[PDB]
Amino acid sequence: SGFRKMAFPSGKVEGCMVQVTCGTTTLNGLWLDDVVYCPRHVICNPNYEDLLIRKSNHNFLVQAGNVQLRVIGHSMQNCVLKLKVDTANPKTPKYKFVRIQPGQTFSVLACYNGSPSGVYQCAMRPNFTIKGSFLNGSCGSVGFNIDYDCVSFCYMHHMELPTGVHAGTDLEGNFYGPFVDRQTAQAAGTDTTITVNVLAWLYAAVINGDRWFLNRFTTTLNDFNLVAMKYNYEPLTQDHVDILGPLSAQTGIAVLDMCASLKELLQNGMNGRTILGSALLEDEFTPFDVVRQCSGVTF
Amino acid sequence: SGFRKMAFPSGKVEGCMVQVTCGTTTLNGLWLDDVVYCPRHVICTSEDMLNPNYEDLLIRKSNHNFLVQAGNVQLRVIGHSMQNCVLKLKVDTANPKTPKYKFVRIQPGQTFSVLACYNGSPSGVYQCAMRPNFTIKGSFLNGSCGSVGFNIDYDCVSFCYMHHMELPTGVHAGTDLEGNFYGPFVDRQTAQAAGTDTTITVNVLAWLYAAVINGDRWFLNRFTTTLNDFNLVAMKYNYEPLTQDHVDILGPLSAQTGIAVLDMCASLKELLQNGMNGRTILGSALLEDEFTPFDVVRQC
Numbered sequence: 001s002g003f004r005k006m007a008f009p010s011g012k013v014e015g016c017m018v019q020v021t022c023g024t025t026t027l028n029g030l031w032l033d034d035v036v037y038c039p040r041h042v043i044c045n046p047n048y049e050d051l052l053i054r055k056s057n058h059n060f061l062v063q064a065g066n067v068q069l070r071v072i073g074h075s076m077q078n079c080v081l082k083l084k085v086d087t088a089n090p091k092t093p094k095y096k097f098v099r100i101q102p103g104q105t106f107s108v109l110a111c112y113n114g115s116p117s118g119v120y121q122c123a124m125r126p127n128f129t130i131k132g133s134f135l136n137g138s139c140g141s142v143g144f145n146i147d148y149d150c151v152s153f154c155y156m157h158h159m160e161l162p163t164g165v166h167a168g169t170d171l172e173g174n175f176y177g178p179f180v181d182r183q184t185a186q187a188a189g190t191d192t193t194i195t196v197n198v199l200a201w202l203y204a205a206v207i208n209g210d211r212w213f214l215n216r217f218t219t220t221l222n223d224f225n226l227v228a229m230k231y232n233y234e235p236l237t238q239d240h241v242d243i244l245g246p247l248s249a250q251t252g253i254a255v256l257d258m259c260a261s262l263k264e265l266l267q268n269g270m271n272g273r274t275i276l277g278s279a280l281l282e283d284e285f286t287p288f289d290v291v292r293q294c295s296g297v298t299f
Numbered sequence: 300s301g302f303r304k305m306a307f308p309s310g311k312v313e314g315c316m317v318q319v320t321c322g323t324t325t326l327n328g329l330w331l332d333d334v335v336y337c338p339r340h341v342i343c344t345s346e347d348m349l350n351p352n353y354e355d356l357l358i359r360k361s362n363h364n365f366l367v368q369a370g371n372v373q374l375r376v377i378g379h380s381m382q383n384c385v386l387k388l389k390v391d392t393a394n395p396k397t398p399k400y401k402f403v404r405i406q407p408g409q410t411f412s413v414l415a416c417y418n419g420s421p422s423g424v425y426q427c428a429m430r431p432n433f434t435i436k437g438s439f440l441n442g443s444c445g446s447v448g449f450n451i452d453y454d455c456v457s458f459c460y461m462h463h464m465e466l467p468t469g470v471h472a473g474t475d476l477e478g479n480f481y482g483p484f485v486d487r488q489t490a491q492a493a494g495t496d497t498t499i500t501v502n503v504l505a506w507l508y509a510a511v512i513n514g515d516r517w518f519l520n521r522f523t524t525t526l527n528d529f530n531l532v533a534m535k536y537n538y539e540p541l542t543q544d545h546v547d548i549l550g551p552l553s554a555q556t557g558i559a560v561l562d563m564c565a566s567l568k569e570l571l572q573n574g575m576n577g578r579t580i581l582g583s584a585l586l587e588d589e590f591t592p593f594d595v596v597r598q599c
């Protein structure tokens with residue numbers, strides 16, 4: 001029993017964190033094989049290729065623990081700077097660079113000065129921002145998932161937006177959202193609730209003995225979406241319905257049956273009650289996260 | 300900016316998790332130097348659990364009865380002893396991944412990270428607090444026994460908890476790394492219930508200071524209170540009594556924000572009386588008590 005916001009064990013990622021200094025700027029790098037990846041704004045209207053041509057290898061000070069790494073080359077790929085180093089990381093794990101979709105969750109290893117300080121779980125919002133916990137010096141901190149023994153790197157922190165939310169890129173330097181790496185007026189779009197995740201979390205509550213919100217009713221997918229659109233909820237697709245299949249079979253509650261409960265929770269509230277210790281409807285657990293936490297899959 | 304429930308990086312602890320098998324039972328062990336620590340109930344059957352005589356069950360065991368597995372490698376047990384509710388298995392190999400560590404006993408209200416394991420393999424990490432009733436609201440399934448709770452302050456891992464059992468209400472009970480249970484619990488299948496739980500008042504106050512640091516002041520009021528008047532109101536909402544130690548410990552946050560501890564106590568009294576009125580504090584619709592004053596100073 002129990003339901004916590006759970007992160008993947010961070011060990012394979014900790015062995016990759018390095019500190020990158022260029023001039024006055026100091027941020028974090030991800031050392032995989034003989035390449036260190038970090039936000040390109042470490043060299044900072046910035047014409048980045050023009051700023052980079054002026055730089056030489058010995059301008060970038062890379063520090064892995066108490067050891068200095070020697071930069072032997074550098075290139076830029078989108079908004080990430082790739083520093084070729086003289087030493088391959090012996091702690092390099094089995095890895096992939098993956099681009100995630102909004103609604104998908106991942107673990108964040110927050111670092112300052114190449115040293116990991118905390119791990120937390122979070123979701124890529126529909127507006128492409130992440131509601132993270134980051135201070136100055138956290139840039140270059142990475143987001144990941146683990147599949148067996150393969151670490152899938154999906155996010156690298158770049159900046160904080162005026163509302164306190166965070167923006168960054170995949171490990172190929174492509175931003176998530178309509179954001180740019182520079183000092184200019186940028187705002188996060190209006191956010192929406194990840195409907196499929198709230199439903200998965202309602203199924204997790206049923207599995208943990210919380211059934212007060214269930215009813216005898218059902219709904220059509222169109223009628224549910226007409227209601228969901230009124231409450232700033234993401235539209236529920238037939239793919240979402242298919243993906244919720246295993247949880248529906250395990251609990252004996254049809255997806256459109258659980259949708260009718262969510263409909264009543266939106267129109268009438270919780271009435272002083274809680275679900276899984278929460279007074280709000282939680283959307284940062286995917287259907288897979290619910291299944292993994294209620295089966296015990298190890299890494 | 301931002302405020303998340305954050306766990307310590309689990310890497311130093313992952314390198315210590317092993318699988319311990321004794322007969323039909325399989326649980327997790329903590330391999331530090333040449334010793335593997337695990338719950339002593341690994342020697343028990345489900346029948347034995349009612350009234351087990353551990354000394355009697357252990358005298359009948361030999362080193363080769365305990366199968367210890369570290370990854371794909373089998374460890375050879377060369378000795379065994381019992382210390383309170385923990386079984387200490389002397390192994391022939393010292394763990395090369397052994398970090399700098401301490402065994403610490405925590406007090407209720409203190410937080411720690413839990414690395415949940417099944418079959419000696421870590422599956423997840425989460426942050427949680429030792430409740431005033433000595434239970435932990437964890438996320439544990441069958442096979443999680445032997446999973447540990449820790450804090451990693453600076454370069455040292457301070458082991459403070461080892462999982463032993465789940466209580467009928469879904470909450471968890473365990474020991475410090477010396478085998479001493481937290482709470483009036485026993486490693487026995489007897490009628491045991493968690494006491495009535497209370498809110499960790501000092502932690503809610505620290506979390507209110509964290510919200511002020513992050514720009515949220517809607518909950519503040521022009522009132523102050525005496526410590527006694529605050530505790531008389533707090534008791535009625537099942538809140539732990541706030542002591543003068545708690546007031547002293549909240550000093551740095553009080554100085555940083557410019558809000559006196561008894562002034563913040565006045566906001567909490569009002570919040571307990573009025574609720575949130577559709578508003579949230581740090582993205583929460585409830586008053587959060589699993590962030591200590593030290594956690595707030597570390598994260599903000």
Ligand SMILES: CN(C)CCOc1ccc2cncc(NC(=O)Cc3cccc(Cl)c3)c2c1
Binds near residue numbers: 139181
């Ligand atoms: C001096 N004091 C006010 C600094 C604290 O500021 C902060 C505070 C919190 C931060 C959290 N994450 C990431 C930061 N970094 C940035 O957003 C830097 C930046 C600026 C313009 C464009 C880009 Cl791409 C990146 C954070 C900086």
Ligand SMILES: CN(C)CCOc1ccc2cncc(NC(=O)Cc3cccc(Cl)c3)c2c1
Binds near residue numbers: 001340439443465487
């Ligand atoms: C359905 N049931 C028979 C399966 C087991 O379910 C569970 C489910 C969740 C569990 C979480 N933590 C720890 C468990 N283990 C124990 O409580 C084992 C035990 C029993 C009596 C006394 C002691 Cl000291 C220890 C959990 C077992």
Ligand SMILES: [Cl-]
Binds near residue numbers: 404405406409
């Ligand atoms: Cl303590």
